[PDB]
Design a protein around this nucleic acid. Structure first.
Length: 1069
RNA sequence: UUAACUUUACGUUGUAGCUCCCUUUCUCGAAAGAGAACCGUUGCUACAAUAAGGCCGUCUGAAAAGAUGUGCCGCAACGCUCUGCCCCUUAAAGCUCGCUUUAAGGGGCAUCGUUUA
């Protein structure tokens, strides 16, 4: 029905979209529709953590406590099956009655006495409950706090063997209490941690001694079962399980994916790097000559690491040649690694360390033997499995050496079998695809609607959610308007970037915003009688001036600073012509006098300065750039000489990141586009998107409105190749002046007027777009939005009377669509558990350490008035350290006796807190703070409204809450809902709601429902900063609202309608 | 890089035995000060619970109890095969002065499906 191009602007939390109708030749002519869709990014917002991480953590904690409870239960049940049970020292649940508080003392006496069945069961249960640390490639090292825990473990094991201690218990008692005053570990310390081997030896010695003094129950079955309980734990993921949790090598499905610390895999990576290597010299780009490869090829084995500096040393590299891909910005760039055979050298040093290897000669194990060492050491996590796998094929001395030092862990995407047929070909200089093609010379049916985004190809949560929402928007646009001709994409550079990368980008952007204002101050004080404030071209002019030593790059005549902003005095030329390269990067922008750019035309410096003829002007200019404060990338670009005219501008026009490659392939293959034929999907390059936005008069106002996301989606949608051709020929006409009274030779036959500004998609493009996106004429933010079709259409027809295609049957105000969130699960209560004792008073008590405790906390100390000296001593020390309690209570704090002496040490005091509501946790002995409400049921009676809050713990227990919030009154005196009330709707977070009160009408997405007031917050759809607190209406009273209802909304911001719910939905199925 | 993955060791809450301070209070004292009761609560150690909640399997058992186990799931992402909810389109009848019913189709969201166990 319409020939339109769908432009998308994909962010990590948004998707802008616009449809632009095109004519037969693909020029843009009408803007049909647009929208913005916003969501929550697939990460923990403040920390950048994975959203699944809290899940994973809590699940593993659940399993740990579950397994321990099961194991202690089996311990009692085995005490029951044999011997000392009691069966009368049990109780209703099954726990031992009057069990004792002395186990450490009893275990230290267990060597000198037959303990009571009571004491015997006590210490057995104690051993099993706290069974020390296990090795889990045998005994080893890596991470700093795991390393600290093993520091403690090894220290205490050595202490038992060297010193006067029979078993861990006696060590604990004697030394720990003589020098510390406690046994078990504290806060984050791991000094008193024991290994499981020492405790198993303790169990066996206790059994020996207790057969020595008469403990009847020293059975085979009791011994063997107790020790099995103490030692058994489920296997870690072994080989075939790990091989299955990975992929299966696509090139050889019978075989698994290779281990990365193997000879063949490391050789594969090294050969790919070697064949990929390029050298950039003074504009040239060349691969490594065969001799260069030979020289480098065996070096990564010979030396520990092959550094780029050393690569430059071995290659006869002249001082101006540099390595492509490397970041050459600062000091030690060529200190980076080019290759490091980590497995080769790990094995070699492991042997060297102990005498199995010479060190003067390369390790002599076979490529296969190294492959087997690597695969086995990466597939198994214990001594015994590794020794079983490797004893068959390599000698025990070198093996035992390998078990002590080696810690390998990663996998690659291809099998050892497929690599062994491939890397002998890349050894002969052929690339990977070519190599695969020769061997496996082989290795897509389209529907109307795009299928789901495959998670296998998108190994990133943020990217996966962004692409899922983009797919939703695409399929909605298809439903409403049919199949698009082509889909043009612009995705933010922060899509696909680590959280730390994004925050670093943010800090760099702030730094640049400060540095440019410093540059403007310098420009001011340089040219003092300068009228204004200066543009960005002027500051760039001065920066290039400084960079080129105040010397024109094309003539050598000194640029005169005082005339720097004289009109026409100095130009900024594109070294390579923008018409043939579409390269607008600062690597291409030089500062020259006006007198010399008139002759240049559309010439590259190579051609213009006659680089082919080795002319004196050419060598002079080439030396003039190599002696400028330019970056090697800029100096390299300015003198390209031999680039791919078409390929270079293809890469400048397109965006080739993995997200964009995957989209351009997946969308094109799997969805129908009624588009001409070749690249039906186009991922615009961000640089040219910015350029086109600036020239087309659209440059946006930096995130004061969620609707700016639509803007670039329009831009990318008008970036069709026909428009590209128009712009190209325009820039070319500009290059060689041609703007006087001439003729446009080709097909326009038009005045090349002195002002022939940049080809636009259509006349008044900017204004129409601004009205369409913001509902306001641009430059006037201050205005009132035409928030209805009528107003919008009348505004478009008034301020764009010349253009009647700016009003049609699809022009509607932009409404940002927010992804709903109606999940009825989640965190049931907050994490810290507090005392439910003084809960009739609105109080709860929690133990607060002194290192956490600041004066606000200390005011609520339970014993503030009982122990006044303690209160005021704490207060005085903290006031000395100004509420930095880490500094305040580093040195131990003590209570004092009435004679003024040091007594018991204090580490944590009890503090009463506020507690009106909570969740009953820990078998009704703890109170927790409520979580976030997953639902709000709304009822009506007497033209007033009543909000029943529904939390997730109530959903778990299956209780549909009775009462509705009453401001002020706490929950016991809330309004009980019965059949006398009329239910209206359930509110989930981010549902669209309308509230008509006496004073105003409010329309937006439900955000929060305060439970002390019954009021609600709503996000304005576009989150405009002018409204509420950062786009949020706070404390909207709905108890006495005239109207209050819920709405339905599209993924495209359409179909806004009230929805009516028949019956109140339950909490459980 | 994804996202799954043995364990330990803490931390919190409840309760015990020992303890440091200390508010009220009784007693002994000419004082200085001592000594004891409830509670608060410092510190050590131990047991329990460690989301709120839901289950398995095996073996006795006649059920209807018991034994019992390297037991299992529960804060997420995605989806639309099953099901619930919302909404939309089209066609056909009628109660009445819209509403109801039938039939075919199309989407969204989930307490539904998968990852998973």
């Amino acid at each position: 029905s319409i020939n339109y191009i769908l432009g998308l602007d994909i962010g990590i939390a948004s998707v802008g979209w616009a449809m632009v109708e095109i004519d037969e030749e693909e020029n843009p002519i009408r803007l049909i529709d647009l929208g913005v869709r916003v969501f929550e990014r697939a990460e923990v917002p403040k920390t950048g953590d994975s959203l699944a991480m809290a899940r994973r953590l809590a699940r593993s904690v659940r399993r740990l406590t579950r397994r321990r409870a099961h194991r202690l239960l089996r311990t009692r049940r085995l005490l029951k099956r044999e011997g000392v049970l009691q069966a009368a020292n049990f109780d209703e649940n099954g726990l031992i009655k009057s069990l004792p508080n002395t186990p450490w003392q009893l275990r230290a006496a267990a060597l000198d006495r037959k303990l009571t069945p009571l004491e015997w069961s006590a210490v057995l249960l104690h051993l099993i409950k706290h069974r020390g640390y296990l090795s889990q490639n045998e005994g080893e090292t890596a991470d700093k706090e795991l390393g600290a825990l093993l520091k403690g473990v090894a220290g205490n094991a050595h202490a038992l063997q060297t010193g006067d201690f029979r078993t861990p218990a006696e060590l604990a008692l004697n030394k720990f209490e003589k020098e510390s005053g406690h046994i078990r570990n504290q806060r984050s310390d791991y000094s008193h941690t024991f290994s499981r081997k020492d405790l198993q030896a303790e169990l066996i010695l206790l059994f020996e001694k207790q057969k020595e003094f008469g403990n009847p129950h020293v059975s085979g079955g009791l011994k063997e079962g107790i020790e099995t309980l103490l030692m058994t734990q489920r296997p870690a993921l072994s080989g075939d399980a790990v091989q299955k949790m990975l992929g299966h090598c696509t090139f050889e499905p019978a075989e698994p994916k290779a281990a990365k610390n193997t000879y063949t895999a490391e050789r594969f990576i090294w050969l790919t790097k070697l064949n990929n290597l390029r050298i950039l010299e003074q504009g040239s780009e060349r691969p490594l000559t065969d001799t260069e490869r030979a020289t480098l090829m065996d070096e990564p084995y010979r030396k520990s690491k092959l550094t780029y500096a050393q690569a430059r040393k071995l290659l006869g590299l002249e001082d101006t040649a540099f390595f492509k891909g490397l970041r050459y910005g600062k000091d030690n760039a060529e200190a980076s690694t080019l290759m490091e055979m980590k497995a080769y050298h790990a094995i070699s040093r492991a042997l060297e360390k102990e005498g199995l290897k010479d060190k003067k000669s390369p390790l002599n194990l076979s490529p296969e033997l190294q492959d087997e060492i690597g695969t086995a050491f990466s597939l198994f996590k214990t001594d015994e499995d590794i020794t079983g796998r490797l004893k068959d094929r390599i000698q025990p001395e070198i093996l035992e050496a390998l078990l002590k030092h080696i810690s390998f862990d990663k996998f690659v995407q291809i099998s050892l079998k497929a690599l062994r047929r491939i890397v002998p070909l890349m050894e002969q200089g052929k690339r990977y695809d070519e190599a695969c093609a020769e061997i496996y010379g082989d290795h897509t049916e389209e529907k109307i609607y795009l299928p789901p985004i495959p998670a296998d190809e998108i190994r990133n949560p943020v990217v996966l959610r962004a692409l899922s929402q983009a797919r939703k928007v695409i399929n909605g646009v298809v439903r409403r308007y049919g199949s698009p001709a082509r889909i043009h994409i612009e995705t933010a550079r922060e899509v696909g970037k680590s959280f730390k990368d994004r925050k670093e980008i943010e800090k760099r952007q702030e730094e640049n915003r400060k540095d440019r204002e410093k540059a403007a101050a310098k420009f001011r004080e340089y040219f003092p009688n300068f009228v204004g404030e200066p543009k960005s071209k002027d500051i760039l002019k001065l920066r290039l001036y400084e960079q080129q030593h105040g010397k024109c790059l094309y003539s050598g005549k000194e640029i005169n600073l005082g005339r720097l902003n004289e009109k026409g005095y100095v130009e900024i030329d594109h070294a390579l012509p923008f018409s043939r390269t579409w390269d607008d990067s600062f690597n291409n922008k030089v500062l020259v006098l006006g007198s010399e750019n008139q002759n240049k035309g559309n010439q590259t410096p190579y051609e213009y300065f006659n680089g082919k003829d080795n002319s004196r002007e050419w060598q002079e200019f080439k030396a003039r750039v190599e002696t400028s404060r330019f970056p090697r990338s800029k100096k390299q670009r300015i003198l390209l000489q031999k680039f791919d005219e078409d390929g270079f501008k293809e890469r400048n026009l397109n965006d080739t990141r993995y997200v964009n490659r995957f989209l351009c392939q997946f969308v094109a293959d799997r969805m129908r586009l009624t588009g001409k034929g070749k690249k039906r999907v186009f991922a615009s390059n961000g640089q040219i998107t910015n350029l086109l936005r600036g020239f087309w008069g659209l440059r946006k106002v930096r995130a004061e409105n969620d609707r700016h996301h639509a803007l670039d989606a329009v831009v990318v949608a008008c970036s069709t190749v026909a428009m590209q051709q128009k712009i190209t020929r325009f820039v070319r006409y500009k290059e060689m002046n041609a703007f006087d009274g001439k003729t446009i030779d080709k097909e326009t036959g038009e005045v090349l007027h002195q002002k022939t500004h940049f080809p636009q998609p259509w006349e008044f493009f900017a204004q129409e777009v601004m009205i369409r996106v913001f509902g306001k004429p641009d430059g006037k933010p201050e205005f009132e939005e035409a928030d209805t079709l009528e107003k919008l259409r009348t505004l478009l027809a008034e301020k764009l009377s010349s253009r009647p295609e700016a009003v049609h049957e699809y022009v509607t105000p932009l409404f940002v669509s927010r992804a709903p969130n109606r999940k009825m699960s989640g965190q049931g209560h907050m994490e810290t558990v507090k005392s439910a004792k003084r809960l009739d008073e609105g109080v709860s008590v929690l133990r607060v350490p002194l290192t956490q405790l600041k004066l606000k906390d200390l005011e609520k100390m339970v014993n503030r008035e009982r122990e006044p000296k303690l209160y005021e001593a704490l207060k005085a020390r903290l006031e000395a350290h100004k509420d930095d309690p880490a500094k305040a209570f580093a040195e131990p704090f003590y209570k004092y006796d009435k004679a003024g002496n040091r007594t018991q040490q204090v580490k944590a005091v009890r503090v009463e807190q506020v507690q009106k509501t909570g969740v009953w946790v820990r078998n009704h002995n703890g109170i927790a703070d409520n979580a976030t409400m997953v639902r709000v049921d709304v009822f009506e009676k007497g033209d007033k409204y009543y909000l029943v809050p529904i939390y997730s713990w109530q959903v778990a227990k299956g209780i549909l809450p009775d009462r509705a919030v009453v401001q002020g009154k706490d929950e016991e005196d809330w309004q009980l809902i019965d059949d006398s009330f009329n239910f209206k709707f359930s509110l989930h977070p981010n549902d669209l709601v309308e509230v008509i009160t006496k004073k105003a009408r409010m329309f937006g997405y439900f955000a929060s429902c305060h439970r002390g007031t019954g009021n609600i917050n709503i996000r304005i759809h576009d989150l405009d900063h002018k409204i509420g607190k950062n786009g949020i209406l706070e404390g909207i009273g709905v108890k006495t609202a005239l109207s209050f209802q819920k709405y339905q909304i599209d993924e495209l911001g359409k179909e806004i309608r009230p929805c009516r719910l028949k019956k109140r939905p339950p909490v459980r199925s």
